[PDB]
Amino acid sequence: YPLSIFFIVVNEFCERFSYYGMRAILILYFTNFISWDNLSTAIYHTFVALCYLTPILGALIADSWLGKFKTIVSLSIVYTIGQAVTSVSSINDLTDSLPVHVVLSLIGLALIALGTGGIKPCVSAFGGDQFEEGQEKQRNRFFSIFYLAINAGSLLSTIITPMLRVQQQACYPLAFGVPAALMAVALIVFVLGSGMYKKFKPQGNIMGKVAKCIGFAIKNRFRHRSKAFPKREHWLDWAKEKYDERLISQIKMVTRVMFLYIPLPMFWALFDQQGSRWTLQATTMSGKIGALEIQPDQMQTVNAILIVIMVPIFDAVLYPLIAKCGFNFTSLKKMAVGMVLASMAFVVAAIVQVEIDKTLPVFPKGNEVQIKVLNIGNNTMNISLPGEMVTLGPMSQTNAFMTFDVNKLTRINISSPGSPVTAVTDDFKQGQRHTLLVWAPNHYQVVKDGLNQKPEKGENGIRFVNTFNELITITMSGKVYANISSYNASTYQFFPSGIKGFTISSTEIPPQCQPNFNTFYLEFGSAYTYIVQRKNDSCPEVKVFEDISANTVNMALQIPQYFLLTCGEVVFSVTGLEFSYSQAPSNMKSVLQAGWLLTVAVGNIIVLIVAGAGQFSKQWAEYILFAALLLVVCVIFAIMARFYTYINPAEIEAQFD
């Protein structure tokens, strides 16, 4: 048997790597039409439907018309041809009949749409078929190894993909060639193993027979409106009138198994919510391990890193250990446990989020308006605010922003010891942090900050304030602040972590002065304001003040929730697909796998429909999103599964004819 399984494993590995490393370049290239076209949105939304519908259109072809082997071969051939046509056409579109080549490229995309889906159920069913005579242990081993191989391909695509771009903007030839070459290699290596495989062909158009039988049965059931109309069994009482009992039993088994999958799409949609939330939580969790400098958005790879190790470990040790203590640990129990663990992952996440909430600042809401005062003069200033008065020495700042309401922010007065009083005439906008600058009794400035949230991706924001008489221009690590007027401040520009250097340029500064300066270690999530001041010899000098404190909590704290989520995903998915194959009848192994994939498709549709989030508070959002939905789904699924859906040994039940 191993000779018949190694080829399948390598083919799956290569195909998955190709698809994952191909999708990103696909979207990058199709962005040409997305922008060139809101007409493009309609096309995309109907196109994704083809990708979500191809699985059934492949399974139906495989089981009834051509068989699994022929379907795999043909679908792989067309998929490779699609990649090849996309690769060749993309060259003309970027070098140069342009609409013709664009149409050929779109036809290639459509062809790939078929291939991406046509292989998923058929290959799994073909792999499962190879085991016989009570080798269920080896079958489970194979299924676990197959699931591991899929994630290994995904991880390799994730790690390799970044190297590709702009390695040669016209690097598309390699981009669309390498996946095609790898898919061709996979197809050839799979085909060369034909001699050892085991294959079957259908007796006929089973799907058409099933459709006709179902129609006749439901019509007959709707007959006899006043003669034993209540069913003894929904189809045994009526379909039996004309059709063979074997087909009746097969459809009965398929319907019975499929009944269990009704709740699963909701679970999938709920589970998918973590992707766009935990990354942001990482953004606000930019604390760093002392050893290395992982970026906030790189945490997502931990899922694959954990799965590719968890999958072997369970089958290797855990299940034998659970069996030794005699727990009789069956499939339905495994799936329920997996979903429960998935639920617990989110409660751990909620605990971490509420722990984080301690050290974040508070930003204005609604009509609230916030102000920070910064004295940049040579002397002390006294400033009167609504219901408060503050004294600031030279080159000094208020520790934190003062919060007021737009209606109540009516009077502001500035004065210095023995100096005249100046009233503020500027206007403050609601929901915006404002910086107030004072350097003299009758000289001040109001600056809109713009920053009302933690910087995206944990980057550090920097801005400069000019105190020189003439304009100044600042360049720092590939970015430039140009033409800053006297006693004015520029907008924030975001930079990644690490130390950075910058140069100061201005006509007022004599050329012989020191041009360059360096900043301290910026860490993550922080924002700082720099003030440039004139020395005795006209040289510039730099001083720093803080605006938002650097982030505190270490980023390693996300590991527990990710570990729980990965365990729940594995122990659920592997057992789910194994059970799906196990209970399917002989004539329809592929259809039920296609139904399993449709289960994920429907969850994807549900998550897309719900779309943007609107929960009032993150702590409650992370909390309910399991405590009120996931456990309810789990209890519903357990109640449904309580009715002996596992009673059927599909392999031998049909022997009674």
Residue numbers in the entry: 12 to 48, 50 to 108, 117 to 188, 195 to 683
In the authors' words:
PepT1 belongs to the solute carrier family 15 (SLC15), also known as the proton-coupled oligopeptide transporter (POT) family, which consists of four members in eukaryotes: PepT1 (SLC15A1), PepT2 (SLC15A2), PhT1 (SLC15A4), and PhT2 (SLC15A3). On a structural level, human PepT1 (HsPepT1) is 708 and human PepT2 (HsPepT2) is 729 amino acids long. Both polypeptides consist of a core transporter unit of predicted 12 transmembrane helices (TMs) of the major facilitator superfamily (MFS) fold and an extracellular immunoglobulin-like domain (ECD) placed between TM9 and TM10.
This previously not captured state allowed us to observe the major structural changes occurring between outward- and inward-facing conformations. In HsPepT1, the large bending of TM2 is stabilized by a hydrogen bond between Y64 (TM2) and N630 (TM11) in the extracellular region of the transporter unit. The sealing of the cytosolic side is stabilized by two interbundle salt bridges between R159 (TM5)–E604 (TM10) and R161 (TM5)–D341 (TM8). (A) In the first step of the transport cycle, the transporter is in an outward-facing open state stabilized by two salt bridges between R159-E604 and R161-D341. Concerning the HsPepT1 structure, 11 residues at the N terminus, four loops connecting TM1-TM2 (residue 49), TM3-TM4 (residues 109 to 116), TM5-TM6 (residues 189 to 194), and TM11-TM12 (residues 638 to 641), and the last 25 residues at the C terminus could not be modeled because of poor density likely caused by intrinsic dynamics and partial disorder.
